[PDB]
Design a protein around this nucleic acid. Structure first.
Ligand code: ZN
Ligand code: ZN
Lengths: 50, 212, 136, 713, 149, 108, 248
RNA sequence: GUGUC
DNA sequence: GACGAATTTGCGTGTCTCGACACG
DNA sequence: TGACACGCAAATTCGTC
C-alpha cells in the first residue's frame, strides 16, 4: 500500500497525548519528525517508535 | 523621465467647418494604391444623400489594342435580347454601401508647411464594382425563351421613395479643386487664441466612464 | 502597359514582370523635410473633453491642438490639460480618396475631387496618466 | 534569505467568510430572484387577443414573499423548515404580481394578484433562517452548522448537482476519422441552438447544417452573402503563397458552375434548401438569422458574418497541413451550470405557457359572451405553476421541448449519513457525458485544472472522473453586460472592422479582438491594450470578473465576460515583491482592512484558467523570479473537502488518498445538533465520539472538531 | 525525440544508484527489507522509493504533456525542457512531496484507476464471446475430439 | 499563380485567340497579349533518405546493469522497469535482457 | 490472462518507436480474424546478409517512390506558342538513393498511369528533363486540365509497390555474426516476396488473411499459433501449446 | 438512482 | 461505329457495447 | 461512439454485330 503518513500520524498523536497539545498535520507543511522525536525524549520514552 | 525636455517639437492644429458639411470619403478596396481612378474619364455620377448612396459609372475605351470584340458583341447581344447607347460595353458600374453612419471621430487631416488642418468627416463610403447588367440580361432572355414583420421589400420601397441627384465630375487640374483646397485649408483665425476648452483629467475620466 | 493584372499577396509591389512599418514621428519628419502637402486620415477618441458628448461638430474654429514630439518616445497631443498619444495603425494598401459633393437646388450639382489618403493615424488618451493624477 | 510574510494564512478564512464553498449556491439563487425574474417579466410583457384589438393585459412589477402556508381558510402563518420537514409539506413562498387588465371599456389595475408559488432555499435571502443567532437557531429546532443549499419538497431534502457543459459562441477545429473539420455552435438567450460545420475533402471545403439538403460550396455562400468579386474573397481569406494553392481548386470549381451574381447564388441555395415566399427570399432570410445568430445583422449587412467565416476558413487552413488541433479536455473553455439558470428556463417556459394558453381561455368567450364585461381573475388558475415546479424538482425530468432539451438525474436526495457526506455532496459536480467505457481523456486528470477541482476526490468504481468535486478556494462568476467594456475598448483606440478590407488582417502586426465569440475589430500593439485593461480592472471602474487573454499563434485577443467561469484570488507582485506586507495584514488581524478593500486597494486579483495561461505564478516566496506576475496564497488549498481529513496527504499514495476520501462520507457518526427531533428514513449514530489528536487546518475551517465521526484507539 | 531519451536515462541512473547505495546502509533486521528478502508483500523498488527517491512519474509511457500552451503548469517557464520542472520528482515519501510533485504523482494514480474500470467490460465481452463458440467440444473414447454433429 | 483583372475584378484563364494565345476571362472584355516569356519557378520539397534502425548503438542509449543471467553465465544484463497491475495489487515489473552472443529477452 | 492484459505497448524505448498493437486489442483482432488489419508488419530475409549497401539497394526496390519526391523543380511555360509543362528530374538525388529510374522510366510510368494521358504529348528533351503538352479535348479547355495535371504528377509513382508504405532495415548482431533483416510495412506479401533481393522462401507476414490467400489454409494455422504466443510472452503469462493448437 | 466487491 | 454484359468501389443501414448484492 | 459483413447502385472496358 506504501503508506508512510500512518506512522507519522501515530508518532504525532502519541507525542501529543503525552505532552497535551494537538499537533498540526496539514498538507505541504505541518510538523516535521525532527522536533517531535526530541520532545518524546524529555518524558522518558524511546525517541521514534519502539 | 526628464530626458524629454530638451527635444520638444511644437505643431499647431486648426479645425474648420467650411468644407465639413460637404465632404465624403470614398474607399476602393479592390484597386491597388499604385494605380489611379481620377485619370480614367468619367461619364456620369449619381448620388442620393438621404441614404448616402452613390452610383458611379466609368467610361473605358471601346477599341484599344487590348480588347476582344468577339466577346464584346456577344455580351451586347445578351444584354440586347436601353442600358448601353453604343454597340459594345464602354461603361463600368460601381455601387456603394453606407458604413459607420455615426461618423464623428474620423476627420481628414492636411499637413501644410508647418500647420495641420483637421476637417470633420460627414460619412465614409466604400465604392465597389457591381455586376447587375448580366442579371437583367439573363432574366429577360429567360422571359423571352419561356413565355407585423419587417421584410426587405418594404425597405426597397423606402429606398424608392427618394428622388435622385446627378453630379458633374472635376478632377486633377481645375480652379475649383484649388478653391476647395484653399477653403478647407484657410483657417481664418491666424492669430493664436486661448481659452477654448479646459477639462482636467479628473473630469475627463469621470465623463468618459459613467459611474451609473 | 499601365493596366496590369494585380496581385493580392504582393499588392504593394505587384511587379510580376520588368512591407516596412515606420513610426509616426519619423513619418511626419520625412513628410516635413520634403516640404510637400498631402492629406491624412486621423481617428479621434469619442466624447472629447469640452462643454452629453463633445465632438468636433459641437466645438469651435481655430487653434485647439498642440502636438509634442519627445526624444526616445512617441507623439503626444494636447488641448491644454488633457493628454493623448497618437500612432499609426492598419497601414492601408488600397486606394482611398476624398471628394467634395455639392448639392444645388433639385438635381444640378458639382462633385470635385480633392485628393487621396495613404496614411491612417489613431489618437487616444492614455489612462495611465489619468489614473496617476486621480490617485495622487 | 528573502523577506517572508508568515501571515497570509488568515486571508483564506476572511475570504471564505464572504463567499466560497456553498455560499455560491445561494448567490446564484439570490441573484436569480432579483435580476432574472424581472427580466423574464419584461420579456413577456404585453399579450392580447385577436378577436378585437381592445382587450390586453400589462405586466408592471412582480415579486415573491416570505415562506407561507395556506391552511383551512385564509390562514397564512410563517412556517419553519422543521415543520415542513416533519409534516411532509414543501417549503415554498407565493409570487404576488401587480398586473392590469381591461374589461369592458375601462381599465382595471388589481394590486397583489397571486399567480402561484415557488420553492425557497433554506439559507436564501427570503427565508427566515438568515441573520439569526444560535440561541434563536435552537428556538426553531434547526442545526446552526447546517450549510443548507437544498430544496425541501414533500419532506425530503433535494439538492441540484452542478453540471458542466462545453462553451457556446466559439469555433472549434478538431480532427475526425478521416481528416480535420471545423465546427461552430451558436446559442444566445433566445432559443436558437445551431451547429454548423465546415469540412475538407478532395481539397474542397463544404458547409454542413441540418437545414440544407447537401453541401454548399463556401465560395457560393460568400457570393450569396454579398461579396461578389472573387479577388476580395481571397483577400479576406488570406494573402499567402500556401493558402492560395489550397483555395484555388474551390475557386475554379465555383467558376465551373455558372454562378457570378448574387441572384444566381441565392437561387442555387434556395434550390438546394429543403424545408417542411419564393426561393430567393428563402435563401436570403436563411443566411440572415438561421446559420449564425450570435452575430447580429443591423439592416441586411452580411459583412461581419463573411469576415467571421473567412477567419474560420483561415483557422482551418492553418490547421490543415499541421498537427495543431483543438481538444475538448481544456477546462478554460468548459463552463459550469448551477441551479439558477435551470430554474430560469423552467420559470420562463411555464410563464410563456401560462400566458399563451390563457390567451386561448378568453378567445372562445368574446364572441360567445353573455354580458358586456369579461372578468379575467375568475378565468385564472394557480395549480399548473406549483404542479410544474414541484414535479420538476422532485421527479427530476427537465424536459423543455420549447428549449429542445431532455435531461434526467439532475436533482438528488441530500446524503444525511454524516456531516462530511452532507457538505461534500454540495460541492459535487456532474459531467455532460454519460457513463461509458469509451471515455479516456475527460476521465484522465488534465493539467489545465489547478486549484479548481480536487484530483484525489473521485469515486472509485465505474465513474472514475465523470464525478468531480470543487476545491476550497474557487468562485463561479455570474453573467454581466458588455456596454462599458465595449465603450472603453472603443475609446482605447480599437478599429472598426467595416472600414478596412481583407488584406490588412493577414498582416502579422494586426491583432483581432474577440468578446464572447464576437469580433470587435482590429487593434495594434496589443500589449498596451492588455496593460491598460488590467490597470482599469485593478482600479475599480470595471468589475473584477472580466477575463482578458492573448494568443500569438493565431494573433487574437479574447475578452471573456460570460457567466460561469472559475475564479480564485491570487496575490499580485511588483517586479520582485508581493504587494501585501506585514502592516497590511496587521490591520486585518485587528478587525479592519478586509477582503473587499484589499481588492479595492489593488493588492489581490482574480484570474481564470485562460488568463493564467499567459501568467507566471510562484508557489512560495523563495521561488519568486523576475517574470512571476502573481503569487499563490497557500498550496494546501488544492486539496478538497473529503481529502482534507487525511493526515500528511503528500506522504500517502494517490490510490490510498482516493480510497480514504471515498470512505470519509460512508463513515458513520453524529449528524448535527438536532438529531433527536429530525425523523429520517435511516440514521447511523455513535455513542462516544472522540476528537482527532492530529488535526488539520481544513478541519478547523469546517469546524469538524464539533462533529467528529471517529474515535482514538 | 533524441533529447527526450538522452536525459531520461540520466534520471533513472540517479534513482538506481541511490537505491543500490541504500541497501548497504540498511540493517539486517529492517522489517521492510526482511519482507523484501522473503518476498511476502513488497519488493526492492518500494524500499528504494520510500527511502531514497520516488523517481520519475511517466504518463502514457512518456513525459507530462503541455496543458496551457507549451508548458505543463503555469508555475514553470515557457518552453522549459528541464527534468525537475516537467516530470521529475526528487523528494521521497519520508521527506515530503511538493505540490507540483504531488500533482505529478497523482496524475499517474488516475492513469491506473481509469484503466481498471474499463478492462472488465471488453474482457467479459470477449470471454462470453469465446465461451459461446467452444462449449461442446468433447473427447470421445477413441482418442478423438468431436462436436455435437 | 493568382491573377485578376483590374477593370472588373474577376480572374482570368488563358486560351487561344486569332494569331496568338491570349489572357481571356468570362466577365468583362479584357485581353492581354502573351509576349516573349512568362513563367514561374516552383520548388517541391524533395525526399530524404532515412536511417537504418536497430543495433547495439541504439542499445547504448538505455543504461544497463550488473546482474547474472542463468542461460549463458554472463554479468551482461540490460534491465527494464515497467508498471502493471496484477490480480491483487500493483507491483512494478522488470524486464531482463542478455547482452551477449545469444541475446534473449525475459520478463520476471 | 486477458483480464490482466490491460496496458498498452510495453517495450518502451527509443530503440524502435514502431506503433505495434499488442495486448487485448491484438488478441481481439486475432479472435475476430478480420480481413483489414492494423499495424502491418512483414519480416523478410536477404540472400546477401553481410553486404549492407546491397540491402540498401534492395530497400529502394520494394518501396513506393513518388515523382514529386524526385522532382527538384517543375515549370509551366507561357509563350506566344502553345504552352506545356516541364519537369526537371534530379539525377544526384536518385544517385545517393540508388534507384532504377531514368527519364524513359518516368515517361512510361505516366503513360500507363490512371490520369488521362497517352503517348501523344509526352517527350524527353534532354538527359533528365521531361515535357508534357496539355491537349484541348474531352472535358473542357486546356487551362482547367493544367490544374488537374499539376496536382497528380507527384501522386504518380515512379517505382515500388504502391500499397507498400514504409520500410526499415534492422541490424541483428551476435558474437561475430551480423545480419540485415528487411521490415516492410504493407500487406501484399506475394509482391514483396517475389523479388530478387529478399529471400522469397524465408519471409513471414502478420495479417492472417494475406498469408491465407498467398500461402494457404494449412500455413495460416501456424502463423496464428506464433502470433498468439508472441502476445503472451511479453506479458509474463503462461499458456500451453495445446490450448492454442485446439483453438487454431 | 446510490453504495461495496 | 454503337449496344448488351460484367467488374470494382463509394455509400446506405442494424446490434450490442462483463457479473453480483443491499436501500429508498 | 468503433466493426465490418450484407445489399444497392453508378462509372467504365472488352467484346461482337
Ligand atoms: Zn476580367
Ligand atoms: Zn543470455
Amino acid at each position: 500500500r506504501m503508506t508512510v503518513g500512518k506512522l507519522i500520524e501515530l508518532l504525532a498523536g502519541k507525542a501529543g497525548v503525552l505532552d497535551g497539545r494537538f499537533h498540526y498535520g496539514t498538507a505541504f507543511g505541518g510538523s516535521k519528525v525532527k522536533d517531535v522525536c526530541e520532545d518524546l525524549v524529555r518524558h522518558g520514552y524511546n525517541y521514534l517508535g519502539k | 523621465n526628464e530626458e524629454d525636455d530638451p527635444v520638444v517639437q511644437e505643431i499647431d492644429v486648426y479645425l474648420a467647418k467650411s468644407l465639413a458639411e460637404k465632404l465624403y470619403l470614398f474607399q476602393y478596396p479592390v484597386r491597388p494604391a499604385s494605380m489611379t481612378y481620377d485619370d480614367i474619364p468619367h461619364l456620369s455620377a449619381k448620388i442620393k444623400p438621404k441614404q448616402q448612396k452613390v452610383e458611379l459609372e466609368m467610361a473605358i475605351d471601346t477599341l484599344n489594342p487590348n480588347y476582344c470584340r468577339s466577346k464584346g458583341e456577344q455580351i451586347a447581344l445578351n444584354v440586347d435580347g436601353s442600358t448601353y447607347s453604343s454597340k459594345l460595353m464602354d461603361k463600368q458600374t460601381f455601387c456603394s454601401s453606407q458604413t459607420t453612419s455615426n461618423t464623428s471621430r474620423y476627420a481628414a487631416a492636411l499637413y501644410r508647411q508647418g500647420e495641420l488642418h483637421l476637417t470633420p468627416l460627414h460619412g465614409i463610403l466604400q465604392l465597389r464594382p457591381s455586376f447587375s447588367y448580366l442579371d437583367k440580361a439573363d432574366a429577360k432572355h429567360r422571359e423571352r425563351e419561356a413565355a407585423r414583420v419587417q421584410s426587405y421589400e418594404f425597405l426597397q420601397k423606402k429606398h424608392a421613395e427618394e428622388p435622385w441627384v446627378h453630379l458633374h465630375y472635376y478632377g486633377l487640374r481645375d480652379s475649383r479643386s484649388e478653391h476647395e483646397r484653399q477653403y478647407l485649408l484657410c483657417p481664418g483665425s491666424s492669430g493664436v487664441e486661448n481659452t477654448e476648452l479646459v477639462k482636467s483629467p479628473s473630469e475627463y475620466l469621470m465623463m468618459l466612464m459613467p459611474p451609473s | 502597359r499601365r493596366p496590369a493584372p494585380p496581385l493580392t499577396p504582393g499588392r504593394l509591389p505587384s511587379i510580376r514582370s520588368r512591407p516596412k512599418d515606420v513610426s509616426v514621428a519619423e513619418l511626419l519628419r520625412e513628410l516635413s523635410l520634403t516640404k510637400e502637402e498631402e492629406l491624412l486620415f486621423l481617428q479621434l477618441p469619442d466624447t472629447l473633453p469640452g462643454q452629453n458628448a463633445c465632438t468636433l461638430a459641437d466645438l469651435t474654429e481655430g487653434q485647439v491642438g498642440k502636438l509634442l514630439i519627445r526624444k526616445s518616445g512617441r507623439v503626444q497631443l494636447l488641448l491644454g490639460k488633457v493628454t493623448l498619444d497618437v500612432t499609426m495603425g492598419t497601414a492601408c494598401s488600397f486606394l482611398q480618396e476624398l471628394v467634395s459633393v455639392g448639392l444645388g437646388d433639385s438635381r444640378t450639382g458639382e462633385m470635385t475631387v480633392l485628393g487621396h489618403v495613404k496614411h491612417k493615424l489613431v489618437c487616444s488618451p492614455d489612462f495611465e496618466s489619468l489614473l496617476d493624477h486621480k490617485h495622487r | 534569505p528573502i523577506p517572508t510574510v508568515e501571515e497570509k494564512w488568515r486571508l483564506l478564512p476572511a475570504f471564505l467568510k464572504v463567499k466560497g464553498l456553498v455560499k455560491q449556491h445561494i448567490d446564484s439563487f439570490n441573484y436569480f430572484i432579483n435580476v432574472e425574474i424581472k427580466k423574464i417579466m419584461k420579456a413577456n410583457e404585453k399579450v392580447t387577443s385577436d378577436a378585437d384589438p381592445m382587450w390586453y393585459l400589462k405586466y408592471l412589477n412582480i415579486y415573491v414573499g416570505l415562506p407561507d402556508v395556506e391552511e383551512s381558510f385564509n390562514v397564512t402563518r410563517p412556517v419553519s423548515p422543521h415543520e415542513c420537514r416533519l409534516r411532509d409539506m414543501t417549503y415554498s413562498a407565493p409570487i404576488t404580481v401587480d398586473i392590469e387588465y381591461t374589461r369592458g371599456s375601462q381599465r382595471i389595475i388589481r394590486n397583489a394578484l397571486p399567480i402561484g408559488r415557488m420553492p425557497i432555499m433554506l439559507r436564501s435571502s427570503n427565508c427566515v433562517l438568515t441573520g439569526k443567532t444560535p440561541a434563536e437557531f435552537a428556538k426553531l429546532n434547526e442545526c446552526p452548522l447546517d450549510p443548507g443549499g437544498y430544496f425541501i419538497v414533500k419532506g425530503v431534502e433535494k439538492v441540484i448537482l452542478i453540471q458542466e457543459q462545453l462553451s457556446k459562441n466559439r469555433i472549434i477545429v478538431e480532427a475526425d476519422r478521416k481528416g480535420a473539420v471545423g465546427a461552430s455552435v451558436t446559442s444566445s438567450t433566445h432559443e436558437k441552438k445551431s451547429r454548423t460545420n465546415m469540412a475538407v475533402k478532395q481539397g474542397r471545403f463544404y458547409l454542413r447544417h441540418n437545414t440544407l439538403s447537401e453541401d454548399i460550396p463556401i465560395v457560393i455562400i460568400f457570393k450569396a452573402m454579398g461579396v461578389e468579386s472573387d479577388q476580395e474573397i481571397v483577400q479576406m481569406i488570406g494573402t499567402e503563397e500556401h493558402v492560395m494553392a489550397a483555395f484555388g481548386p474551390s475557386l475554379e470549381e465555383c467558376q465551373k458552375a455558372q454562378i457570378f451574381t448574387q441572384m444566381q447564388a441565392l437561387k442555387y441555395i434556395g434550390n438546394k434548401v429543403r424545408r417542411q415566399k419564393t426561393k430567393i427570399e428563402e435563401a436570403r432570410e436563411l443566411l440572415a438569422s438561421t446559420i449564425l445568430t450570435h452575430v447580429p445583422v443591423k439592416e441586411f449587412n452580411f459583412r461581419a458574418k463573411c469576415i467571421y467565416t473567412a477567419v474560420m476558413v483561415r483557422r482551418v487552413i492553418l490547421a490543415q497541413g499541421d498537427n495543431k488541433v483543438d481538444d475538448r479536455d481544456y477546462y478554460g473553455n468548459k463552463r459550469l451550470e448551477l441551479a439558477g439558470q435551470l430554474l430560469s428556463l423552467l420559470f420562463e417556459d411555464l410563464f410563456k405557457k401560462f400566458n399563451s394558453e390563457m390567451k386561448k381561455i378568453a378567445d372562445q368567450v368574446i364572441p360567445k359572451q353573455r354580458a358586456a364585461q369579461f372578468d379575467v381573475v375568475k378565468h385564472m388558475r394557480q395549480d399548473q405553476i406549483t404542479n410544474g415546479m414541484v414535479n420538476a424538482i422532485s421527479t427530476g425530468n427537465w424536459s423543455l421541448k420549447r428549449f429542445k432539451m431532455d435531461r434526467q438525474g439532475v436533482t438528488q436526495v441530500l446524503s444525511r449519513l454524516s456531516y462530511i457526506s452532507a457538505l461534500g455532496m454540495m460541492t459535487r459536480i456532474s459531467s455532460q457525458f454519460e457513463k461509458t467505457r469509451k471515455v479516456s481523456g475527460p476521465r484522465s486528470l488534465q493539467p489545465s485544472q489547478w486549484g479548481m477541482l480536487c484530483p484525489s476526490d473521485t469515486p472509485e468504481g465505474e465513474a472514475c472522473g465523470l464525478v468531480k468535486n470543487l476545491a476550497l478556494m474557487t468562485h463561479i462568476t455570474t453573467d454581466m453586460e458588455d456596454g462599458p467594456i465595449v465603450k472603453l475598448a472603443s475609446n482605447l483606440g480599437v478599429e472598426d472592422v467595416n472600414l478596412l478590407c481583407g488584406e490588412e488582417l493577414s498582416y502579422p502586426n494586426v491583432f483581432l479582438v474577440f468578446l464572447n465569440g464576437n469580433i470587435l475589430g482590429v487593434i495594434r500593439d496589443h500589449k498596451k491594450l492588455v496593460n491598460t485593461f488590467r490597470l482599469m480592472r485593478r482600479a475599480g471602474y470595471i468589475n473584477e470578473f472580466v477575463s482578458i487573454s492573448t494568443n500569438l499563434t493565431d494573433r487574437c485577443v479574447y475578452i471573456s465576460s460570460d457567466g460561469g467561469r472559475l475564479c480564485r484570488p491570487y496575490i499580485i507582485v511588483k517586479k520582485q515583491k508581493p504587494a501585501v506586507t506585514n502592516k497590511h495584514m496587521e490591520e486585518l488581524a485587528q478587525g479592519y482592512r478586509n477582503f473587499e478593500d484589499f481588492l479595492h486597494e489593488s493588492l489581490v486579483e482574480y484570474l481564470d484558467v485562460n488568463e493564467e495561461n499567459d501568467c507566471n505564478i510562484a508557489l512560495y516566496e523563495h521561488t519568486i523570479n523576475k517574470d512571476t506576475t502573481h503569487l499563490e496564497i497557500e498550496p494546501f488549498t488544492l486539496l478538497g473537502v473529503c481529502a482534507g481529513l487525511i493526515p500528511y496527504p503528500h506522504h500517502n499514495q494517490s490510490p490510498r488518498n482516493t480510497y480514504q476520501c471515498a470512505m470519509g462520507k460512508q463513515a458513520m457518526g453524529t449528524i448535527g445538533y438536532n438529531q433527536r427531533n429530525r425523523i429520517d428514513t435511516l440514521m447511523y449514530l455513535l455513542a462516544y465520539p472522540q476528537k482527532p489528536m492530529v488535526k488539520t487546518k481544513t478541519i478547523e475551517l469546517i469546524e469538524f472538531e464539533k462533529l467528529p465521526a471517529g474515535q482514538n484507539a | 525525440e533524441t533529447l527526450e531519451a538522452l536525459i531520461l536515462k540520466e534520471l533513472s541512473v540517479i534513482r538506481d544508484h541511490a537505491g543500490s547505495a541504500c541497501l548497504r546502509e540498511l540493517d539486517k533486521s529492517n522489517s521492510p527489507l526482511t519482507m523484501a528478502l522473503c518476498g511476502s508483500k513488497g519488493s526492492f523498488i518500494n524500499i528504494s522509493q520510500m527511502i531514497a527517491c520516488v523517481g520519475q512519474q511517466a504518463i502514457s509511457g512518456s513525459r507530462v504533456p503541455d496543458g496551457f500552451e507549451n508548458r505543463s503548469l503555469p508555475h514553470f517557464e515557457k518552453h522549459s525542457k528541464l527534468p525537475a520542472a516537467k516530470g521529475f520528482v526528487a523528494n521521497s515519501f519520508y521527506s515530503g512531496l511538493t505540490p507540483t510533485e504531488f500533482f505529478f504523482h497523482t496524475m499517474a494514480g488516475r492513469e491506473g484507476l481509469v484503466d481498471t474500470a474499463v478492462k472488465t467490460a471488453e474482457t467479459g465481452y470477449m470471454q462470453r464471446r469465446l465461451v459461446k463458440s467452444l462449449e461442446d467440444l468433447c473427447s470421445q473414447y477413441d482418442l478423438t475430439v468431436r462436436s455435437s454433429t | 499563380m493568382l491573377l485578376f483583372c483590374p477593370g472588373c475584378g474577376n480572374g482570368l484563364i488563358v486560351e487561344e485567340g486569332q494569331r496568338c494565345h491570349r489572357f481571356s476571362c468570362n466577365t468583362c472584355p479584357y485581353v492581354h497579349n502573351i509576349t516573349r516569356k512568362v513563367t514561374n519557378r516552383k520548388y517541391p520539397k524533395l525526399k530524404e533518405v532515412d536511417d537504418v534502425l536497430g543495433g547495439a548503438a541504439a542499445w547504448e542509449n538505455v543504461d544497463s546493469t550488473a546482474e547474472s543471467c542463468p542461460k549463458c553465465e554472463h554479468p551482461r544484463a540490460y534491465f527494464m522497469q515497467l508498471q502493471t497491475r496484477s490480480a491483487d495489487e500493483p507491483m512494478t515489473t522488470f524486464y531482463k535482457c542478455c547482452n551477449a552472443q545469444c541475446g534473449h529477452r525475459w520478463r520476471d | 490472462p486477458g483480464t490482466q492484459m490491460t496496458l498498452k505497448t510495453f517495450h518502451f524505448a527509443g530503440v524502435a518507436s514502431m506503433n505495434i498493437t499488442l495486448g487485448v486489442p491484438r488478441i481481439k483482432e486475432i479472435i475476430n480474424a478480420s480481413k483489414a488489419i492494423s499495424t502491418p508488419i512483414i519480416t523478410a530475409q536477404l540472400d546477401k546478409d553481410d553486404d549492407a549497401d546491397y540491402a540498401r539497394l534492395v530497400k529502394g526496390r520494394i518501396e513506393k517512390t513518388l515523382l514529386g519526391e524526385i522532382s527538384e523543380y517543375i515549370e509551366e511555360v507561357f509563350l506566344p506558342d502553345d504552352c506545356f509543362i516541364l519537369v526537371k528530374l534530379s539525377l544526384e538525388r536518385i544517385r545517393l538513393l540508388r534507384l532504377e529510374v531514368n527519364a524513359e522510366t518516368v515517361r512510361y510510368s505516366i503513360c500507363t498511369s490512371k490520369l488521362r494521358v497517352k503517348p501523344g504529348d509526352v517527350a524527353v528533351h534532354g538527359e533528365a528533363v521531361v515535357c508534357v503538352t496539355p491537349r484541348e479535348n474531352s472535358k473542357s479547355s486546356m487551362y482547367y486540365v493544367l490544374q488537374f495535371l499539376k496536382e497528380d504528377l507527384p501522386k504518380v509513382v515512379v517505382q515500388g509497390i504502391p500499397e507498400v508504405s514504409r520500410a526499415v532495415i534492422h541490424i541483428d548482431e551476435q558474437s561475430g555474426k551480423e545480419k540485415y533483416k528487411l521490415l516492410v510495412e504493407g500487406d501484399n506479401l506475394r509482391a514483396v516476396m517475389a523479388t530478387h533481393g529478399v529471400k522469397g522462401t524465408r519471409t513471414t507476414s502478420n495479417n492472417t488473411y494475406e498469408v491465407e490467400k498467398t500461402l494457404g489454409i494449412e500455413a495460416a494455422r501456424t502463423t496464428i499459433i506464433n502470433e498468439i504466443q508472441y502476445t503472451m510472452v511479453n506479458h509474463g503469462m503462461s499458456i500451453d501449446r495445446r490450448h492454442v493448437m485446439l483453438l487454431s
